[PDB]
Design a binder for this molecule. Structure first.
Ligand SMILES: Cc1oc(C)c(S(=O)(=O)N[C@@H]2CCOc3ccc(F)cc32)c1C(=O)O
Length: 358
């Protein structure tokens, strides 16, 4: 790697790892379209296994970017439309509060207050139906944004129904395989367990637990190499040969709603570049990112703006991840760690690195 990339990365990440006590970390910088990789520390403390470019990390909510792109692919395939009512794909959803709630509302957290978490009590398909039938919106559709697994998770499950495929099968065949993400998984195979890092929470080794809509909302595990490739694909959709996936990537970066300085895409979130760093940094703190906020509709949605800071934070109980990229500069970063450390620290480090290279 160019010494300039080496210098800013090490000068930024070394202090970060010490201040946050991160056991292991992998970082990729995409610079003029080329990836450069960095690793530190331990994938497994107990067995002294180092983090490598093949270590799998839990992406948590960065998984929602794969869900949003897979949904965009279904749109491009003509299988679903964002302007279609939720009940078109779940007719058993007969409760009257669902009138007027479209797939767009589900994909973008604007259904009217769907909860952040699906309740642990919810498991079976009939358990989920009962949960959404009984749910009472606090707001009319399309008026407030409340970040929610039960929202985009449902979007993901419904968006693959016309394909007839399972959500995982659709993700593998329409997103992972065409993009050569050959070490990215909803379920980690036994052959790959040697590369699966442990997450660390209060010093205990943990992996994510199964839960309703986990695949759709926080279920992807991946390597720094595949995530670099994920970033490259989202920086330059036009180089992707499968037409509907290229189009679905563009749809996931369209701007559907605005709240404050931020624009909601499908999974991805976007701000105009150049950004005020305090705006994305403080904006990422859960105090703000998880709050109920009124939204302005963007009518009709703005297509992917190349002068944007496109990003997603993501966490599990034992992992913390961040992706950000600026399509206009062919510049991006992936930060994967096996500790859940605060979002603003992630974004601040990412901004220092990317601002130095832009
Ligand atoms: C900001 C946010 O809220 C929610 C519900 C998610 S999550 O569902 O996608 N991630 C997992 C689910 C299961 O264990 C944990 C434990 C702690 C934690 F911070 C995330 C997660 C995220 C995120 O990942 O950013």
């Amino acid at each position: 790697a160019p010494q300039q990339i080496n210098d800013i990365v090490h000068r930024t990440i070394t202090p970060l790892i010490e201040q946050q006590k991160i056991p292991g970390m992998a970082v990729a910088v995409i610079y003029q379209g080329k990836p450069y990789y960095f690793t530190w520390g331990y994938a497994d403390i107990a067995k002294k296994q180092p983090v490598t470019q093949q270590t799998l990390f839990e992406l948590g909510s960065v998984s929602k970017t794969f869900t949003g792109v897979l949904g965009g692919d279904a749109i491009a395939r003509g299988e679903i439309k964002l302007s279609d009512p939720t009940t078109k794909y779940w007719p058993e959803l007969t409760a009257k509060q669902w009138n007027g709630i479209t797939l767009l509302h589900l994909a973008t957290y604007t259904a009217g207050g769907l909860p952040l978490q699906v309740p642990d009590e919810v498991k079976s398909s009939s358990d989920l139906l009962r949960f959404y039938q009984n749910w009472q919106p606090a707001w009319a559709p399309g008026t407030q944004r409340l970040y929610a697994n039960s929202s985009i998770g449902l979007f993901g499950a419904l968006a693959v129904k016309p394909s007839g495929l399972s959500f995982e099968q659709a993700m593998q065949t329409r997103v992972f395989q065409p993009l050569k993400l050959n070490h990215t998984w909803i379920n980690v195979p036994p052959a790959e367990e040697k590369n699966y890092a442990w997450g660390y929470r209060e010093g205990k080794a943990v992996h994510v637990s199964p839960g309703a809509l986990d695949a759709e909302a926080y279920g992807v595990k991946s390597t720094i190499e595949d995530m670099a490739r994920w970033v490259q694909s989202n920086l330059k959709p036009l180089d992707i040969n499968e037409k509907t996936l290229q189009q679905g990537i563009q749809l996931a970066q369209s701007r559907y709603w605005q709240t404050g300085d931020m624009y909601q895409g499908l999974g991805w979130e976007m701000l105009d570049w150049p950004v005020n760093p305090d705006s994305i940094i403080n904006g990422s703190d859960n105090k703000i990112a998880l709050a109920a906020r009124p939204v302005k509709a963007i009518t009709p949605p703005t297509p992917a703006v190349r002068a944007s800071w496109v990003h997603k934070t993501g966490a599990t109980g034992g992992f913390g991840s961040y992706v950000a990229f600026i399509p206009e500069k062919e510049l991006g970063i992936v930060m994967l760690a096996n500790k859940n450390y605060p979002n603003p620290a992630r974004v601040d480090a990412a901004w220092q690195i990317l601002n130095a290279l832009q």
